[PDB]
Ligand binder design. Structure first.
Ligand code: 69G
Length: 129
């Protein structure tokens, strides 16, 4: 299971060191509390936040960049929907998304390596089954 452990480790470091460090990103750190935003869950059908991404990483939900990026992109998509394309929340979520893509890009070689090797371990597991 250890290429998956290393992979999750890296994703988690992206979330804490890059995405959470975006200025004024605090609104995206945790699930919305309906007390503070009364309509959020009536408008937003698939909520997402950085704490949920971190909890998903620690459970090894993400085997590849694609499923990680799907949740990351969801944060920006919910913000366009709820706040509008030019809201300050959306600009902050766009920086969160943009710095995530950039970091994945800078780690592209090692991350392709890990992704391929998580798969090859998945297959060895099947050639047991
Ligand atoms: C899951 C993240 C969603 C991002 N988001 C958060 C808040 C917001 C504002 C103030 C407090 C909270 C909140 O519930 N906290 C900090 C727990 C969320 C907000 C207010 C208007 N639009 C938004 C918004 O798009």
């Amino acid at each position: 299971d250890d290429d998956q452990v290393a992979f999750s480790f890296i994703l988690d470091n992206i979330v804490t060191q890059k995405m959470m460090a975006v200025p004024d990103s605090w609104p995206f750190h945790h699930p919305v509390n309906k007390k503070f935003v009364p309509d959020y869950y009536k408008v937003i059908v698939n909520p997402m936040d950085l704490e949920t991404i971190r909890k998903n990483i620690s459970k090894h939900k993400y085997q590849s960049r694609e499923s990680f990026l799907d949740d990351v992109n969801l944060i920006l998509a919910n913000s366009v929907k709820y706040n509008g394309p030019e809201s300050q929340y959306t600009k902050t979520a766009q920086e969160i998304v943009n710095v995530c893509y950039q970091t994945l890009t800078e780690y592209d070689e090692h991350l392709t390596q890990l992704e391929k090797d998580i798969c090859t371990a998945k297959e060895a597991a099947l050639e047991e089954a």
